[PDB]
Scaffold this motif. Sequence first.
Motif, PDB file in Angstrom:
ATOM      1  N   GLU A   2     -11.741  10.689   7.332  1.00 48.13           N
ATOM      2  CA  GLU A   2     -11.707   9.326   5.945  1.00 48.13           C
ATOM      3  C   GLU A   2     -12.953   8.248   5.640  1.00 48.13           C
ATOM      4  OE1 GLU A   2      -8.739   6.174   7.210  1.00 48.13           O
ATOM      5  OE2 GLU A   2      -8.487   5.506   5.012  1.00 48.13           O
ATOM      6  N   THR A   3     -13.373   8.252   4.951  1.00 44.26           N
ATOM      7  CA  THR A   3     -14.335   7.565   4.431  1.00 44.26           C
ATOM      8  C   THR A   3     -14.633   5.936   4.666  1.00 44.26           C
ATOM      9  OG1 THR A   3     -14.575   7.548   2.093  1.00 44.26           O
ATOM     10  CG2 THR A   3     -15.172   9.128   2.791  1.00 44.26           C
ATOM     11  N   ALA A   4     -15.718   5.283   4.329  1.00 41.86           N
ATOM     12  CA  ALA A   4     -15.133   3.987   4.905  1.00 41.86           C
ATOM     13  C   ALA A   4     -14.667   3.853   3.206  1.00 41.86           C
ATOM     14  CB  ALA A   4     -16.571   3.112   5.309  1.00 41.86           C
ATOM     15  N   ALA A   5     -15.482   3.936   2.497  1.00 40.92           N
ATOM     16  CA  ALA A   5     -15.220   3.569   0.935  1.00 40.92           C
ATOM     17  C   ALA A   5     -13.395   3.994   0.596  1.00 40.92           C
ATOM     18  CB  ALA A   5     -15.673   3.804   0.063  1.00 40.92           C
ATOM     19  N   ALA A   6     -13.076   4.922   1.850  1.00 39.88           N
ATOM     20  CA  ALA A   6     -10.949   5.243   1.064  1.00 39.88           C
ATOM     21  C   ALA A   6     -10.649   4.361   2.372  1.00 39.88           C
ATOM     22  CB  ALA A   6     -11.132   6.698   2.152  1.00 39.88           C
ATOM     23  N   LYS A   7     -11.252   3.481   3.461  1.00 41.10           N
ATOM     24  CA  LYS A   7     -10.597   2.635   4.248  1.00 41.10           C
ATOM     25  C   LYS A   7     -10.645   1.520   4.035  1.00 41.10           C
ATOM     26  CE  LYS A   7     -10.493   1.275   8.939  1.00 41.10           C
ATOM     27  NZ  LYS A   7     -11.338   1.549  10.450  1.00 41.10           N
ATOM     28  N   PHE A   8     -11.619   0.686   3.035  1.00 44.99           N
ATOM     29  CA  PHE A   8     -11.912  -0.173   2.346  1.00 44.99           C
ATOM     30  C   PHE A   8     -10.236  -0.024   1.326  1.00 44.99           C
ATOM     31  CE2 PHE A   8     -13.186  -4.492   0.745  1.00 44.99           C
ATOM     32  CZ  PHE A   8     -12.672  -4.014  -0.440  1.00 44.99           C
ATOM     33  N   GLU A   9     -10.345   0.577   0.954  1.00 46.79           N
ATOM     34  CA  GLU A   9      -8.989   0.598   0.055  1.00 46.79           C
ATOM     35  C   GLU A   9      -7.803   0.412   0.431  1.00 46.79           C
ATOM     36  OE1 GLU A   9      -8.925   2.866  -4.045  1.00 46.79           O
ATOM     37  OE2 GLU A   9     -10.734   3.231  -3.056  1.00 46.79           O
ATOM     38  N   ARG A  10      -7.570   1.242   1.789  1.00 44.73           N
ATOM     39  CA  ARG A  10      -6.587   1.309   2.354  1.00 44.73           C
ATOM     40  C   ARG A  10      -5.880   0.444   3.055  1.00 44.73           C
ATOM     41  NH1 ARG A  10      -5.277   2.110   7.473  1.00 44.73           N
ATOM     42  NH2 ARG A  10      -7.498   4.090   7.567  1.00 44.73           N
ATOM     43  N   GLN A  11      -7.328  -0.639   3.430  1.00 44.47           N
ATOM     44  CA  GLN A  11      -6.607  -1.780   4.431  1.00 44.47           C
ATOM     45  C   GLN A  11      -6.713  -2.816   3.267  1.00 44.47           C
ATOM     46  OE1 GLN A  11     -10.218  -2.272   7.570  1.00 44.47           O
ATOM     47  NE2 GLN A  11      -7.975  -1.508   8.960  1.00 44.47           N
ATOM     48  N   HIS A  12      -7.438  -3.008   2.420  1.00 46.84           N
ATOM     49  CA  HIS A  12      -7.704  -4.298   1.659  1.00 46.84           C
ATOM     50  C   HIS A  12      -7.791  -4.425   0.564  1.00 46.84           C
ATOM     51  CE1 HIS A  12      -9.857  -5.882   5.345  1.00 46.84           C
ATOM     52  NE2 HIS A  12     -10.688  -5.009   5.290  1.00 46.84           N
ATOM     53  N   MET A  13      -6.725  -2.984  -0.275  1.00 53.59           N
ATOM     54  CA  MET A  13      -6.226  -3.471  -1.650  1.00 53.59           C
ATOM     55  C   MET A  13      -5.008  -3.370  -2.276  1.00 53.59           C
ATOM     56  SD  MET A  13      -9.365  -3.822  -3.815  1.00 53.59           S
ATOM     57  CE  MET A  13      -8.295  -3.822  -5.541  1.00 53.59           C
ATOM     58  N   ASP A  14      -4.771  -4.295  -3.101  1.00 45.63           N
ATOM     59  CA  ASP A  14      -2.794  -4.317  -3.428  1.00 45.63           C
ATOM     60  C   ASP A  14      -2.832  -4.563  -5.037  1.00 45.63           C
ATOM     61  OD1 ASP A  14      -0.210  -4.038  -3.383  1.00 45.63           O
ATOM     62  OD2 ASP A  14       0.017  -5.660  -2.840  1.00 45.63           O
ATOM     63  N   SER A  15      -3.408  -3.439  -5.322  1.00 45.26           N
ATOM     64  CA  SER A  15      -3.501  -3.426  -7.407  1.00 45.26           C
ATOM     65  C   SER A  15      -2.194  -3.694  -7.633  1.00 45.26           C
ATOM     66  CB  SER A  15      -4.121  -2.528  -7.644  1.00 45.26           C
ATOM     67  OG  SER A  15      -6.154  -2.550  -7.251  1.00 45.26           O
ATOM     68  N   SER A  16      -1.144  -2.512  -7.144  1.00 44.63           N
ATOM     69  CA  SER A  16       0.087  -2.851  -7.210  1.00 44.63           C
ATOM     70  C   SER A  16       1.621  -4.089  -7.295  1.00 44.63           C
ATOM     71  CB  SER A  16       0.792  -1.635  -6.184  1.00 44.63           C
ATOM     72  OG  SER A  16       1.044  -2.885  -5.490  1.00 44.63           O
ATOM     73  N   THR A  17       0.322  -5.384  -6.807  1.00 50.46           N
ATOM     74  CA  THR A  17       1.315  -6.345  -6.528  1.00 50.46           C
ATOM     75  C   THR A  17       0.473  -7.821  -7.278  1.00 50.46           C
ATOM     76  OG1 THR A  17       0.833  -7.463  -4.742  1.00 50.46           O
ATOM     77  CG2 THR A  17       3.242  -5.441  -5.474  1.00 50.46           C
ATOM     78  N   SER A  18       0.300  -8.909  -7.779  1.00 48.35           N
ATOM     79  CA  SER A  18      -0.116  -9.703  -8.270  1.00 48.35           C
ATOM     80  C   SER A  18      -0.779 -11.025  -7.207  1.00 48.35           C
ATOM     81  CB  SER A  18       0.228 -10.511  -9.682  1.00 48.35           C
ATOM     82  OG  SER A  18       1.407 -11.102  -8.908  1.00 48.35           O
ATOM     83  N   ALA A  19       0.541 -10.647  -6.176  1.00 45.81           N
ATOM     84  CA  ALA A  19       0.335 -11.914  -5.534  1.00 45.81           C
ATOM     85  C   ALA A  19       1.471 -11.537  -4.081  1.00 45.81           C
ATOM     86  CB  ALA A  19       0.395 -13.636  -5.801  1.00 45.81           C
ATOM     87  N   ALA A  20       1.060 -12.084  -3.078  1.00 52.27           N
ATOM     88  CA  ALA A  20       2.833 -11.483  -2.020  1.00 52.27           C
ATOM     89  C   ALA A  20       3.985 -12.234  -2.170  1.00 52.27           C
ATOM     90  CB  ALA A  20       2.406 -12.753  -1.349  1.00 52.27           C
ATOM     91  N   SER A  21       5.196 -11.313  -2.758  1.00 49.05           N
ATOM     92  CA  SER A  21       6.044 -11.744  -3.141  1.00 49.05           C
ATOM     93  C   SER A  21       7.083 -12.451  -2.438  1.00 49.05           C
ATOM     94  CB  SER A  21       7.200 -11.102  -4.311  1.00 49.05           C
ATOM     95  OG  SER A  21       7.605 -10.053  -3.163  1.00 49.05           O
TER      96      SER A  21
END
Length: 124
Positions: A2-21
């Motif tokens: 896995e690339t460091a850019a893909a790792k960043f997306e997997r560990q840190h991005m959550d575009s699917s929710t506006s916030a923790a519910s």
Amino acid sequence: KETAAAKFERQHMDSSTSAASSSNYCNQMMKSRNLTKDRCKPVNTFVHESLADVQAVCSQKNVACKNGQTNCYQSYSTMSITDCRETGSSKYPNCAYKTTQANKHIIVACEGNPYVPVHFDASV
């Protein structure tokens, strides 16, 4: 691997929710993103913003990363983020976290071409 850019997306991005519910956000996500697979990752932030807006931070305000590297950037705008930190009861493989939702500026390290985030440095 896995690339460091893909790792960043997997560990840190959550575009699917506006916030923790719910308080269970971190428990659920730390597991589903495979951050508890081999050990309980102790601290992790999730950013509830589009990936393009987070990638754009790489062209925003330069700042030295905690470790001194000079390829860190601070977002101009605040962002919706979820801070996840282990609870006192967390014990592998039953990793457990406190979920803290907040609006903060993010600081990330960037690399490559395209120049994209590869590390989450801090929420300020």
